[PDB]
Design a binder for this molecule. Structure first.
Ligand SMILES: COc1ccc(S(=O)(=O)N(CC(C)C)C[C@@H](O)[C@H](Cc2ccccc2)NC(=O)O[C@H]2CO[C@H]3OCC[C@H]32)cc1
Lengths: 99, 99
């Protein structure tokens, strides 16, 4: 599909058995999801943007389905105000910017 | 052009007659640029990111050319970690997401 940018590019994702709304974010190197209790091992990480840094938990090789497109990669979990699909997963679903 | 996302979507912009590098950021509602001198009037505003809120100077109806495409709109100037081009300008140059 083609998504215009009049409104936030929110799409439905499936992760850890749950459906959520997430932002297709070309400005995000990594995928950052709102706080959730995923199983498995993780490593602490700090990511920074406008306003400063937040502490997140890095999970690797997590399966995510984005608009019926399957993907698997690193997912960060922490106190983000929004679910953010970053470039590490956008590349896997064949997402491009066009103008 | 069609821009893949295996690298940061960085492009050259022109604003106030000066060239800069900026990030095409579909996850940003607004355009926020690093500290710079801009002619014209401005008003103080606050914007929130993943790490909290920052003070910025809002410039309205500013001419800005993005990868050869012209836009005229609001530009926020403040302590952002990166020059980001947000949806308010991405729409003006006809930018869409596609997968
Ligand atoms: C390492 O992996 C990372 C992944 C994501 C980020 S980030 O979130 O700080 N950022 C980065 C951008 C500011 C360069 C992505 C931007 O698209 C980021 C995503 C976001 C965070 C909080 C609330 C809404 C939207 N958007 C953002 O900061 O936009 C600003 C400017 O316009 C406003 O709309 C959204 C919030 C305001 C940082 C690191």
């Amino acid at each position: 599909p083609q998504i215009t940018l009049w409104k936030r590019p929110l799409v439905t994702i499936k992760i850890g058995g749950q459906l959520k709304e997430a932002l297709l974010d070309t400005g995000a190197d990594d995928t950052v999801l709102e706080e959730m209790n995923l199983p498995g091992r993780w490593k602490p990480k700090m990511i920074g943007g406008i306003g400063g840094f937040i502490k997140v938990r890095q999970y690797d090789q997590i399966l995510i389905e984005i608009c019926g497109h399957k993907a698997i990669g690193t997912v960060l979990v922490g106190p983000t105000p929004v679910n953010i699909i970053g470039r590490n997963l956008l590349t896997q679903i064949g997402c491009t910017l066009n103008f």
